[PDB]
Amino acid sequence: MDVMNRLILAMDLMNRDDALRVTGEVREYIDTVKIGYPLVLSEGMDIIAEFRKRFGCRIIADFKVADIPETNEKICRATFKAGADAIIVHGFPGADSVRACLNVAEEMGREVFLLTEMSHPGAEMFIQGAADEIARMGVDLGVKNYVGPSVRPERLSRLREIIGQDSFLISPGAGAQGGDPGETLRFADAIIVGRSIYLADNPAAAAAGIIESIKDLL
Amino acid sequence: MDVMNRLILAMDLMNRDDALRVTGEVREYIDTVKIGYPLVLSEGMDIIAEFRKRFGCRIIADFKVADIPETNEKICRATFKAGADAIIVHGFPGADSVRACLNVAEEMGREVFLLTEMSHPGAEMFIQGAADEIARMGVDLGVKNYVGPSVRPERLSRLREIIGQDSFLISPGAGAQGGDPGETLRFADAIIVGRSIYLADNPAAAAAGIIESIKDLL
Ligand SMILES: O=c1cc(O)n([C@@H]2O[C@H](COP(=O)(O)O)[C@@H](O)[C@H]2O)c(=O)[nH]1
Ligand SMILES: O=c1cc(O)n([C@@H]2O[C@H](COP(=O)(O)O)[C@@H](O)[C@H]2O)c(=O)[nH]1
């Protein structure tokens, strides 16, 4: 996956009008948008088609899929049928649940991202201790795309070590959660940014500024 | 909540006409329906209102919420706005993520169910080792409703022990995944059943049959 400016917009606005407006405002800077449940549950799966029609951006469905295999398969099918290019899947529920997503993605020609360690403080309770193993599991399963936390660069570094330089790694937590874009891009291929852009008075300027701060990494 | 016949239908059909037909056919036996992402992502969040309009059923939104606290809040808000009585939340992302859901539920007068251990084989990799602590964390947070696996009675028993007799416990995995309704109701207040009912030639007969088998526990 070739992410423009190593920057993925986390479009978590919950109003169709606002979401389309803000994404339109930053379209020149990004070609990849992560759409999650806040938007989808508020506006419907048709929002994915709407984004594709208006922007042509790649769409990563951030559904943190975390069900049993049978249900995971149904979720992935519905998601890819709606036009998502990729889906984010939790690794914590284990290998079979991940494989179920990999199977659908393989059949439909889409991508799975494996979420290994999360960026919020609660991640330290259970996820962090399992994260290295989750990443190794992804490697065993042939997962090529991963998600890890901007706010813990030492953990992001470990994740990168595990998956190798050829795997694709994206990382949320830059900006609002305190992660630094430049430091994060030492290890991740692209950063995910939501509030620092979409809550900005001027989202275009916010996007431009982030990109300016990392220009030597582009 | 008072679940009729201790039986919750997992309506994971992905076609609105089929979902409505089957639910309507079993409505005499079940007043609580679990609606997850397979149906919601196929038919939209409007499906929740449609079920409310057609049937006298409580709706549990099985969305396995597993994001950071800020995103969890948005998901719960969108879900309760759509008319869900309750939402199911993963505990593995930790206490802050759960607390975020509890805050919205308290604010909107709805219920949170904490998913502790899952019923699929992959659950043994990471979730199982954390499940006792997740349950205990639920108790510390004041969570009153829990989900645990029908297919591991020993684990379901431990869960019930941790949360106490006053907590409400529902359990999937009966039927298609090999769990036994009767054994499961030794520990769970209600069982969740999907395929054994919705894939039956006569779903009403399938539900009636299950209820008949546990008649003494009602
Ligand atoms: O570990 C993770 C994984 C995520 O997907 N996310 C997601 O990435 C986005 C981060 O948004 P923000 O830049 O406003 O913090 C949100 O959509 C959130 O759900 C995260 O914050 N941490
Ligand atoms: O540990 C769990 C937690 C669940 O929510 N579920 C859900 O419960 C339902 C079980 O359906 P079924 O009876 O067809 O196996 C599905 O909707 C599934 O996503 C589960 O099977 N195991």
Side-chain angles (χ1 to χ4, degrees), chain A residues 2-11 22-34 51 55-59 191 193 197 203-204 207-208 210-211:
Chain A
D2 189 330
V3 168
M4 173 170 295
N5 290 319
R6 303 182 70 176
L7 178 61
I8 297 164
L9 174 64
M11 182 31 66
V22 173
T23 307
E25 282 167 17
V26 301
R27 63 189 302 172
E28 56 178 313
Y29 302 110
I30 62 94
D31 67 1
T32 310
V33 180
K34 186 177 74 60
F51 270 57
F55 313 117
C57 54
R58 268 177 310 258
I59 299 295
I191 54 175
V193 179
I197 294 172
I210 293 170
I211 292 177

PDB file of all heavy atoms in Angstrom, chain A residues 2-11 22-34 51 55-59 191 193 197 203-204 207-208 210-211:
ATOM      1  N   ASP A   2       0.550   2.196  -0.881  1.00  0.00           N
ATOM      2  CA  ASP A   2       1.329   3.428  -0.988  1.00  0.00           C
ATOM      3  C   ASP A   2       0.526   4.597  -0.436  1.00  0.00           C
ATOM      4  O   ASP A   2      -0.324   5.162  -1.129  1.00  0.00           O
ATOM      5  CB  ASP A   2       1.703   3.689  -2.450  1.00  0.00           C
ATOM      6  CG  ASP A   2       2.701   4.824  -2.608  1.00  0.00           C
ATOM      7  OD1 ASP A   2       2.698   5.753  -1.769  1.00  0.00           O
ATOM      8  OD2 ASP A   2       3.490   4.783  -3.579  1.00  0.00           O
ATOM      9  N   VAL A   3       0.804   4.968   0.809  1.00  0.00           N
ATOM     10  CA  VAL A   3       0.030   6.011   1.465  1.00  0.00           C
ATOM     11  C   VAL A   3       0.624   7.390   1.237  1.00  0.00           C
ATOM     12  O   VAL A   3       1.746   7.677   1.659  1.00  0.00           O
ATOM     13  CB  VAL A   3      -0.103   5.732   2.976  1.00  0.00           C
ATOM     14  CG1 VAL A   3      -0.657   6.952   3.707  1.00  0.00           C
ATOM     15  CG2 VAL A   3      -0.968   4.504   3.201  1.00  0.00           C
ATOM     16  N   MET A   4      -0.137   8.248   0.570  1.00  0.00           N
ATOM     17  CA  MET A   4       0.329   9.594   0.273  1.00  0.00           C
ATOM     18  C   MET A   4       0.710  10.341   1.544  1.00  0.00           C
ATOM     19  O   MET A   4      -0.063  10.380   2.510  1.00  0.00           O
ATOM     20  CB  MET A   4      -0.744  10.367  -0.485  1.00  0.00           C
ATOM     21  CG  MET A   4      -0.399  11.822  -0.689  1.00  0.00           C
ATOM     22  SD  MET A   4      -1.578  12.566  -1.828  1.00  0.00           S
ATOM     23  CE  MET A   4      -1.201  11.641  -3.310  1.00  0.00           C
ATOM     24  N   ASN A   5       1.903  10.934   1.535  1.00  0.00           N
ATOM     25  CA  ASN A   5       2.403  11.712   2.669  1.00  0.00           C
ATOM     26  C   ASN A   5       2.513  10.950   3.995  1.00  0.00           C
ATOM     27  O   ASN A   5       2.643  11.566   5.050  1.00  0.00           O
ATOM     28  CB  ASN A   5       1.583  12.996   2.857  1.00  0.00           C
ATOM     29  CG  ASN A   5       1.819  14.005   1.745  1.00  0.00           C
ATOM     30  OD1 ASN A   5       2.957  14.207   1.302  1.00  0.00           O
ATOM     31  ND2 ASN A   5       0.746  14.634   1.277  1.00  0.00           N
ATOM     32  N   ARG A   6       2.454   9.623   3.929  1.00  0.00           N
ATOM     33  CA  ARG A   6       2.581   8.777   5.120  1.00  0.00           C
ATOM     34  C   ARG A   6       1.556   9.177   6.175  1.00  0.00           C
ATOM     35  O   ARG A   6       1.785   9.024   7.377  1.00  0.00           O
ATOM     36  CB  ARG A   6       4.005   8.865   5.676  1.00  0.00           C
ATOM     37  CG  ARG A   6       5.053   8.483   4.645  1.00  0.00           C
ATOM     38  CD  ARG A   6       6.456   8.535   5.221  1.00  0.00           C
ATOM     39  NE  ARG A   6       6.689   7.465   6.183  1.00  0.00           N
ATOM     40  CZ  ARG A   6       7.861   7.237   6.775  1.00  0.00           C
ATOM     41  NH1 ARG A   6       8.906   8.012   6.508  1.00  0.00           N
ATOM     42  NH2 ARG A   6       7.990   6.237   7.638  1.00  0.00           N
ATOM     43  N   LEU A   7       0.423   9.697   5.711  1.00  0.00           N
ATOM     44  CA  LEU A   7      -0.602  10.247   6.600  1.00  0.00           C
ATOM     45  C   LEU A   7      -1.977   9.691   6.281  1.00  0.00           C
ATOM     46  O   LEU A   7      -2.470   9.843   5.170  1.00  0.00           O
ATOM     47  CB  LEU A   7      -0.636  11.766   6.476  1.00  0.00           C
ATOM     48  CG  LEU A   7      -1.681  12.510   7.309  1.00  0.00           C
ATOM     49  CD1 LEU A   7      -1.440  12.266   8.807  1.00  0.00           C
ATOM     50  CD2 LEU A   7      -1.630  13.998   6.984  1.00  0.00           C
ATOM     51  N   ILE A   8      -2.594   9.053   7.266  1.00  0.00           N
ATOM     52  CA  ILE A   8      -3.923   8.481   7.108  1.00  0.00           C
ATOM     53  C   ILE A   8      -4.886   9.247   7.993  1.00  0.00           C
ATOM     54  O   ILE A   8      -4.659   9.383   9.189  1.00  0.00           O
ATOM     55  CB  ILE A   8      -3.927   7.013   7.524  1.00  0.00           C
ATOM     56  CG1 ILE A   8      -2.998   6.209   6.603  1.00  0.00           C
ATOM     57  CG2 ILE A   8      -5.357   6.440   7.516  1.00  0.00           C
ATOM     58  CD1 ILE A   8      -2.637   4.852   7.140  1.00  0.00           C
ATOM     59  N   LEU A   9      -5.956   9.760   7.399  1.00  0.00           N
ATOM     60  CA  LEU A   9      -6.955  10.505   8.148  1.00  0.00           C
ATOM     61  C   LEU A   9      -7.907   9.566   8.876  1.00  0.00           C
ATOM     62  O   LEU A   9      -8.556   8.718   8.248  1.00  0.00           O
ATOM     63  CB  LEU A   9      -7.758  11.390   7.191  1.00  0.00           C
ATOM     64  CG  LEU A   9      -8.940  12.118   7.839  1.00  0.00           C
ATOM     65  CD1 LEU A   9      -8.465  13.111   8.902  1.00  0.00           C
ATOM     66  CD2 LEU A   9      -9.772  12.835   6.766  1.00  0.00           C
ATOM     67  N   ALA A  10      -8.006   9.719  10.195  1.00  0.00           N
ATOM     68  CA  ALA A  10      -8.998   8.974  10.964  1.00  0.00           C
ATOM     69  C   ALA A  10     -10.283   9.794  10.982  1.00  0.00           C
ATOM     70  O   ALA A  10     -10.411  10.725  11.764  1.00  0.00           O
ATOM     71  CB  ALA A  10      -8.506   8.728  12.384  1.00  0.00           C
ATOM     72  N   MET A  11     -11.215   9.468  10.093  1.00  0.00           N
ATOM     73  CA  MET A  11     -12.439  10.264   9.966  1.00  0.00           C
ATOM     74  C   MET A  11     -13.518   9.793  10.942  1.00  0.00           C
ATOM     75  O   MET A  11     -14.398   9.006  10.584  1.00  0.00           O
ATOM     76  CB  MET A  11     -12.928  10.272   8.511  1.00  0.00           C
ATOM     77  CG  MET A  11     -14.173  11.123   8.257  1.00  0.00           C
ATOM     78  SD  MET A  11     -14.343  12.574   9.313  1.00  0.00           S
ATOM     79  CE  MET A  11     -12.943  13.555   8.768  1.00  0.00           C
ATOM     80  N   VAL A  22     -14.870  17.901   5.933  1.00  0.00           N
ATOM     81  CA  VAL A  22     -13.504  17.873   6.448  1.00  0.00           C
ATOM     82  C   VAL A  22     -12.572  17.029   5.571  1.00  0.00           C
ATOM     83  O   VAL A  22     -11.440  17.425   5.288  1.00  0.00           O
ATOM     84  CB  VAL A  22     -13.465  17.384   7.905  1.00  0.00           C
ATOM     85  CG1 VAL A  22     -12.021  17.208   8.367  1.00  0.00           C
ATOM     86  CG2 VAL A  22     -14.222  18.355   8.799  1.00  0.00           C
ATOM     87  N   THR A  23     -13.045  15.874   5.120  1.00  0.00           N
ATOM     88  CA  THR A  23     -12.241  15.051   4.225  1.00  0.00           C
ATOM     89  C   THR A  23     -11.947  15.787   2.913  1.00  0.00           C
ATOM     90  O   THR A  23     -10.824  15.757   2.411  1.00  0.00           O
ATOM     91  CB  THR A  23     -12.920  13.701   3.940  1.00  0.00           C
ATOM     92  OG1 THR A  23     -13.238  13.060   5.185  1.00  0.00           O
ATOM     93  CG2 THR A  23     -11.990  12.807   3.154  1.00  0.00           C
ATOM     94  N   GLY A  24     -12.957  16.462   2.373  1.00  0.00           N
ATOM     95  CA  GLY A  24     -12.764  17.276   1.191  1.00  0.00           C
ATOM     96  C   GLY A  24     -11.704  18.336   1.416  1.00  0.00           C
ATOM     97  O   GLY A  24     -10.902  18.627   0.528  1.00  0.00           O
ATOM     98  N   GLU A  25     -11.680  18.900   2.619  1.00  0.00           N
ATOM     99  CA  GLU A  25     -10.744  19.972   2.933  1.00  0.00           C
ATOM    100  C   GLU A  25      -9.293  19.498   2.941  1.00  0.00           C
ATOM    101  O   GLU A  25      -8.379  20.279   2.663  1.00  0.00           O
ATOM    102  CB  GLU A  25     -11.111  20.627   4.264  1.00  0.00           C
ATOM    103  CG  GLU A  25     -12.273  21.601   4.145  1.00  0.00           C
ATOM    104  CD  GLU A  25     -12.851  22.011   5.486  1.00  0.00           C
ATOM    105  OE1 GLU A  25     -12.179  21.810   6.518  1.00  0.00           O
ATOM    106  OE2 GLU A  25     -13.985  22.533   5.512  1.00  0.00           O
ATOM    107  N   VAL A  26      -9.078  18.225   3.250  1.00  0.00           N
ATOM    108  CA  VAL A  26      -7.712  17.714   3.349  1.00  0.00           C
ATOM    109  C   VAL A  26      -7.345  16.754   2.223  1.00  0.00           C
ATOM    110  O   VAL A  26      -6.267  16.182   2.219  1.00  0.00           O
ATOM    111  CB  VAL A  26      -7.439  17.068   4.729  1.00  0.00           C
ATOM    112  CG1 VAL A  26      -7.652  18.095   5.838  1.00  0.00           C
ATOM    113  CG2 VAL A  26      -8.332  15.871   4.944  1.00  0.00           C
ATOM    114  N   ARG A  27      -8.244  16.609   1.254  1.00  0.00           N
ATOM    115  CA  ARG A  27      -8.080  15.637   0.170  1.00  0.00           C
ATOM    116  C   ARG A  27      -6.769  15.779  -0.604  1.00  0.00           C
ATOM    117  O   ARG A  27      -6.220  14.791  -1.092  1.00  0.00           O
ATOM    118  CB  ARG A  27      -9.261  15.732  -0.802  1.00  0.00           C
ATOM    119  CG  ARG A  27      -9.358  17.086  -1.499  1.00  0.00           C
ATOM    120  CD  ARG A  27     -10.651  17.217  -2.280  1.00  0.00           C
ATOM    121  NE  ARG A  27     -10.766  16.152  -3.265  1.00  0.00           N
ATOM    122  CZ  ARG A  27     -11.850  15.918  -3.994  1.00  0.00           C
ATOM    123  NH1 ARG A  27     -12.926  16.682  -3.848  1.00  0.00           N
ATOM    124  NH2 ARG A  27     -11.853  14.917  -4.866  1.00  0.00           N
ATOM    125  N   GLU A  28      -6.273  17.004  -0.735  1.00  0.00           N
ATOM    126  CA  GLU A  28      -5.033  17.229  -1.464  1.00  0.00           C
ATOM    127  C   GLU A  28      -3.822  16.634  -0.735  1.00  0.00           C
ATOM    128  O   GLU A  28      -2.766  16.444  -1.334  1.00  0.00           O
ATOM    129  CB  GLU A  28      -4.820  18.724  -1.722  1.00  0.00           C
ATOM    130  CG  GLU A  28      -4.826  19.575  -0.464  1.00  0.00           C
ATOM    131  CD  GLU A  28      -4.567  21.046  -0.740  1.00  0.00           C
ATOM    132  OE1 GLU A  28      -3.621  21.359  -1.495  1.00  0.00           O
ATOM    133  OE2 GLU A  28      -5.311  21.891  -0.195  1.00  0.00           O
ATOM    134  N   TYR A  29      -3.981  16.332   0.548  1.00  0.00           N
ATOM    135  CA  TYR A  29      -2.854  15.887   1.368  1.00  0.00           C
ATOM    136  C   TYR A  29      -2.864  14.397   1.666  1.00  0.00           C
ATOM    137  O   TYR A  29      -1.851  13.838   2.083  1.00  0.00           O
ATOM    138  CB  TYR A  29      -2.823  16.643   2.695  1.00  0.00           C
ATOM    139  CG  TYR A  29      -2.728  18.136   2.544  1.00  0.00           C
ATOM    140  CD1 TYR A  29      -3.798  18.953   2.873  1.00  0.00           C
ATOM    141  CD2 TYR A  29      -1.565  18.730   2.075  1.00  0.00           C
ATOM    142  CE1 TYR A  29      -3.713  20.324   2.739  1.00  0.00           C
ATOM    143  CE2 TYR A  29      -1.471  20.099   1.937  1.00  0.00           C
ATOM    144  CZ  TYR A  29      -2.550  20.891   2.273  1.00  0.00           C
ATOM    145  OH  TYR A  29      -2.470  22.256   2.137  1.00  0.00           O
ATOM    146  N   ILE A  30      -4.016  13.764   1.477  1.00  0.00           N
ATOM    147  CA  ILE A  30      -4.172  12.366   1.840  1.00  0.00           C
ATOM    148  C   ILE A  30      -4.856  11.598   0.715  1.00  0.00           C
ATOM    149  O   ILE A  30      -5.615  12.173  -0.069  1.00  0.00           O
ATOM    150  CB  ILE A  30      -4.988  12.236   3.142  1.00  0.00           C
ATOM    151  CG1 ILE A  30      -6.394  12.812   2.960  1.00  0.00           C
ATOM    152  CG2 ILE A  30      -4.287  12.968   4.278  1.00  0.00           C
ATOM    153  CD1 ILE A  30      -7.442  11.788   2.577  1.00  0.00           C
ATOM    154  N   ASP A  31      -4.583  10.306   0.620  1.00  0.00           N
ATOM    155  CA  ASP A  31      -5.301   9.468  -0.332  1.00  0.00           C
ATOM    156  C   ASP A  31      -5.763   8.208   0.368  1.00  0.00           C
ATOM    157  O   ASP A  31      -6.144   7.222  -0.261  1.00  0.00           O
ATOM    158  CB  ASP A  31      -4.456   9.154  -1.576  1.00  0.00           C
ATOM    159  CG  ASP A  31      -3.262   8.266  -1.284  1.00  0.00           C
ATOM    160  OD1 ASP A  31      -3.064   7.864  -0.118  1.00  0.00           O
ATOM    161  OD2 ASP A  31      -2.520   7.947  -2.237  1.00  0.00           O
ATOM    162  N   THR A  32      -5.724   8.258   1.693  1.00  0.00           N
ATOM    163  CA  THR A  32      -6.118   7.122   2.506  1.00  0.00           C
ATOM    164  C   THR A  32      -6.907   7.608   3.705  1.00  0.00           C
ATOM    165  O   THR A  32      -6.457   8.468   4.448  1.00  0.00           O
ATOM    166  CB  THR A  32      -4.887   6.369   3.001  1.00  0.00           C
ATOM    167  OG1 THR A  32      -4.028   6.104   1.886  1.00  0.00           O
ATOM    168  CG2 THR A  32      -5.292   5.063   3.661  1.00  0.00           C
ATOM    169  N   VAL A  33      -8.103   7.063   3.870  1.00  0.00           N
ATOM    170  CA  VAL A  33      -8.953   7.467   4.978  1.00  0.00           C
ATOM    171  C   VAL A  33      -9.354   6.238   5.758  1.00  0.00           C
ATOM    172  O   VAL A  33      -9.773   5.231   5.175  1.00  0.00           O
ATOM    173  CB  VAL A  33     -10.214   8.193   4.485  1.00  0.00           C
ATOM    174  CG1 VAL A  33     -11.090   8.593   5.667  1.00  0.00           C
ATOM    175  CG2 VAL A  33      -9.830   9.411   3.672  1.00  0.00           C
ATOM    176  N   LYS A  34      -9.184   6.313   7.075  1.00  0.00           N
ATOM    177  CA  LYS A  34      -9.648   5.281   7.975  1.00  0.00           C
ATOM    178  C   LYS A  34     -11.045   5.690   8.432  1.00  0.00           C
ATOM    179  O   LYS A  34     -11.226   6.744   9.046  1.00  0.00           O
ATOM    180  CB  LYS A  34      -8.687   5.155   9.171  1.00  0.00           C
ATOM    181  CG  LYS A  34      -8.996   3.999  10.110  1.00  0.00           C
ATOM    182  CD  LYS A  34      -7.969   3.881  11.253  1.00  0.00           C
ATOM    183  CE  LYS A  34      -8.141   4.969  12.310  1.00  0.00           C
ATOM    184  NZ  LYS A  34      -9.488   4.931  12.952  1.00  0.00           N
ATOM    185  N   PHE A  51     -17.607   8.064   0.008  1.00  0.00           N
ATOM    186  CA  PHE A  51     -16.236   8.563   0.033  1.00  0.00           C
ATOM    187  C   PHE A  51     -15.518   8.203  -1.257  1.00  0.00           C
ATOM    188  O   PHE A  51     -14.790   9.014  -1.815  1.00  0.00           O
ATOM    189  CB  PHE A  51     -15.464   8.018   1.247  1.00  0.00           C
ATOM    190  CG  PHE A  51     -15.575   8.893   2.462  1.00  0.00           C
ATOM    191  CD1 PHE A  51     -16.813   9.208   2.991  1.00  0.00           C
ATOM    192  CD2 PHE A  51     -14.436   9.411   3.073  1.00  0.00           C
ATOM    193  CE1 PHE A  51     -16.924  10.024   4.107  1.00  0.00           C
ATOM    194  CE2 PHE A  51     -14.541  10.221   4.193  1.00  0.00           C
ATOM    195  CZ  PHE A  51     -15.781  10.529   4.712  1.00  0.00           C
ATOM    196  N   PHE A  55     -14.006  11.147  -3.435  1.00  0.00           N
ATOM    197  CA  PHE A  55     -12.570  11.356  -3.249  1.00  0.00           C
ATOM    198  C   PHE A  55     -11.673  10.320  -3.914  1.00  0.00           C
ATOM    199  O   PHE A  55     -10.513  10.596  -4.205  1.00  0.00           O
ATOM    200  CB  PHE A  55     -12.234  11.410  -1.757  1.00  0.00           C
ATOM    201  CG  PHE A  55     -13.148  12.284  -0.969  1.00  0.00           C
ATOM    202  CD1 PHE A  55     -13.943  11.750   0.026  1.00  0.00           C
ATOM    203  CD2 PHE A  55     -13.209  13.648  -1.212  1.00  0.00           C
ATOM    204  CE1 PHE A  55     -14.790  12.557   0.758  1.00  0.00           C
ATOM    205  CE2 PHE A  55     -14.047  14.459  -0.480  1.00  0.00           C
ATOM    206  CZ  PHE A  55     -14.841  13.917   0.505  1.00  0.00           C
ATOM    207  N   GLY A  56     -12.197   9.121  -4.129  1.00  0.00           N
ATOM    208  CA  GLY A  56     -11.394   8.048  -4.680  1.00  0.00           C
ATOM    209  C   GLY A  56     -10.309   7.546  -3.736  1.00  0.00           C
ATOM    210  O   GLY A  56      -9.510   6.684  -4.103  1.00  0.00           O
ATOM    211  N   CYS A  57     -10.278   8.086  -2.522  1.00  0.00           N
ATOM    212  CA  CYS A  57      -9.305   7.671  -1.515  1.00  0.00           C
ATOM    213  C   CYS A  57      -9.424   6.188  -1.216  1.00  0.00           C
ATOM    214  O   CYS A  57     -10.509   5.610  -1.347  1.00  0.00           O
ATOM    215  CB  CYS A  57      -9.560   8.436  -0.218  1.00  0.00           C
ATOM    216  SG  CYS A  57     -11.271   8.287   0.390  1.00  0.00           S
ATOM    217  N   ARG A  58      -8.323   5.568  -0.799  1.00  0.00           N
ATOM    218  CA  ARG A  58      -8.396   4.222  -0.263  1.00  0.00           C
ATOM    219  C   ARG A  58      -9.136   4.300   1.053  1.00  0.00           C
ATOM    220  O   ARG A  58      -9.001   5.276   1.785  1.00  0.00           O
ATOM    221  CB  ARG A  58      -7.003   3.654  -0.014  1.00  0.00           C
ATOM    222  CG  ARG A  58      -6.436   2.864  -1.184  1.00  0.00           C
ATOM    223  CD  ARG A  58      -5.024   2.419  -0.841  1.00  0.00           C
ATOM    224  NE  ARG A  58      -4.278   3.575  -0.376  1.00  0.00           N
ATOM    225  CZ  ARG A  58      -3.402   4.249  -1.107  1.00  0.00           C
ATOM    226  NH1 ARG A  58      -3.106   3.850  -2.338  1.00  0.00           N
ATOM    227  NH2 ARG A  58      -2.801   5.305  -0.589  1.00  0.00           N
ATOM    228  N   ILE A  59      -9.922   3.275   1.349  1.00  0.00           N
ATOM    229  CA  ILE A  59     -10.682   3.246   2.587  1.00  0.00           C
ATOM    230  C   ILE A  59     -10.245   2.070   3.445  1.00  0.00           C
ATOM    231  O   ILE A  59     -10.305   0.907   3.026  1.00  0.00           O
ATOM    232  CB  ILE A  59     -12.194   3.156   2.334  1.00  0.00           C
ATOM    233  CG1 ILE A  59     -12.677   4.374   1.536  1.00  0.00           C
ATOM    234  CG2 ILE A  59     -12.943   3.031   3.655  1.00  0.00           C
ATOM    235  CD1 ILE A  59     -12.539   5.689   2.274  1.00  0.00           C
ATOM    236  N   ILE A 191       1.377   7.354   9.648  1.00  0.00           N
ATOM    237  CA  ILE A 191       0.711   7.663  10.904  1.00  0.00           C
ATOM    238  C   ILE A 191      -0.763   7.874  10.639  1.00  0.00           C
ATOM    239  O   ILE A 191      -1.162   8.330   9.563  1.00  0.00           O
ATOM    240  CB  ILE A 191       1.284   8.915  11.587  1.00  0.00           C
ATOM    241  CG1 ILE A 191       1.279  10.105  10.627  1.00  0.00           C
ATOM    242  CG2 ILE A 191       2.694   8.643  12.132  1.00  0.00           C
ATOM    243  CD1 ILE A 191       1.722  11.424  11.291  1.00  0.00           C
ATOM    244  N   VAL A 193      -3.953  10.001  11.890  1.00  0.00           N
ATOM    245  CA  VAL A 193      -4.281  11.204  12.630  1.00  0.00           C
ATOM    246  C   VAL A 193      -5.761  11.535  12.504  1.00  0.00           C
ATOM    247  O   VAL A 193      -6.272  11.658  11.394  1.00  0.00           O
ATOM    248  CB  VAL A 193      -3.444  12.394  12.131  1.00  0.00           C
ATOM    249  CG1 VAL A 193      -3.815  13.654  12.897  1.00  0.00           C
ATOM    250  CG2 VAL A 193      -1.959  12.091  12.287  1.00  0.00           C
ATOM    251  N   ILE A 197      -6.488  16.781  13.211  1.00  0.00           N
ATOM    252  CA  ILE A 197      -6.974  17.323  11.943  1.00  0.00           C
ATOM    253  C   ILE A 197      -8.457  17.672  11.994  1.00  0.00           C
ATOM    254  O   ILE A 197      -8.834  18.809  11.729  1.00  0.00           O
ATOM    255  CB  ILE A 197      -6.707  16.357  10.765  1.00  0.00           C
ATOM    256  CG1 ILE A 197      -5.202  16.231  10.537  1.00  0.00           C
ATOM    257  CG2 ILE A 197      -7.380  16.845   9.473  1.00  0.00           C
ATOM    258  CD1 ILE A 197      -4.823  15.162   9.528  1.00  0.00           C
ATOM    259  N   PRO A 203      -8.815  22.303   9.223  1.00  0.00           N
ATOM    260  CA  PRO A 203      -8.237  20.964   9.035  1.00  0.00           C
ATOM    261  C   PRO A 203      -7.162  20.912   7.954  1.00  0.00           C
ATOM    262  O   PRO A 203      -6.167  20.206   8.123  1.00  0.00           O
ATOM    263  CB  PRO A 203      -9.444  20.105   8.637  1.00  0.00           C
ATOM    264  CG  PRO A 203     -10.624  20.820   9.225  1.00  0.00           C
ATOM    265  CD  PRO A 203     -10.290  22.291   9.183  1.00  0.00           C
ATOM    266  N   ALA A 204      -7.351  21.643   6.860  1.00  0.00           N
ATOM    267  CA  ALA A 204      -6.348  21.673   5.800  1.00  0.00           C
ATOM    268  C   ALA A 204      -4.998  22.167   6.333  1.00  0.00           C
ATOM    269  O   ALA A 204      -3.959  21.554   6.082  1.00  0.00           O
ATOM    270  CB  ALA A 204      -6.820  22.545   4.641  1.00  0.00           C
ATOM    271  N   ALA A 207      -3.439  19.545   8.612  1.00  0.00           N
ATOM    272  CA  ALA A 207      -2.819  18.499   7.802  1.00  0.00           C
ATOM    273  C   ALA A 207      -1.508  18.989   7.204  1.00  0.00           C
ATOM    274  O   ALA A 207      -0.483  18.303   7.274  1.00  0.00           O
ATOM    275  CB  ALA A 207      -3.753  18.045   6.710  1.00  0.00           C
ATOM    276  N   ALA A 208      -1.549  20.175   6.606  1.00  0.00           N
ATOM    277  CA  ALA A 208      -0.352  20.768   6.013  1.00  0.00           C
ATOM    278  C   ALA A 208       0.790  20.894   7.024  1.00  0.00           C
ATOM    279  O   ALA A 208       1.951  20.627   6.706  1.00  0.00           O
ATOM    280  CB  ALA A 208      -0.683  22.125   5.401  1.00  0.00           C
ATOM    281  N   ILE A 210       1.310  19.173   9.885  1.00  0.00           N
ATOM    282  CA  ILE A 210       1.862  17.870  10.212  1.00  0.00           C
ATOM    283  C   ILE A 210       2.818  17.416   9.123  1.00  0.00           C
ATOM    284  O   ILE A 210       3.918  16.941   9.397  1.00  0.00           O
ATOM    285  CB  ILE A 210       0.746  16.824  10.348  1.00  0.00           C
ATOM    286  CG1 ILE A 210      -0.113  17.137  11.576  1.00  0.00           C
ATOM    287  CG2 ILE A 210       1.348  15.432  10.410  1.00  0.00           C
ATOM    288  CD1 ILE A 210      -1.383  16.315  11.663  1.00  0.00           C
ATOM    289  N   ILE A 211       2.387  17.560   7.880  1.00  0.00           N
ATOM    290  CA  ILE A 211       3.191  17.147   6.749  1.00  0.00           C
ATOM    291  C   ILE A 211       4.489  17.961   6.683  1.00  0.00           C
ATOM    292  O   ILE A 211       5.564  17.421   6.417  1.00  0.00           O
ATOM    293  CB  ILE A 211       2.380  17.230   5.440  1.00  0.00           C
ATOM    294  CG1 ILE A 211       1.276  16.163   5.466  1.00  0.00           C
ATOM    295  CG2 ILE A 211       3.290  17.038   4.241  1.00  0.00           C
ATOM    296  CD1 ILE A 211       0.354  16.177   4.268  1.00  0.00           C
TER     297      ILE A 211
END
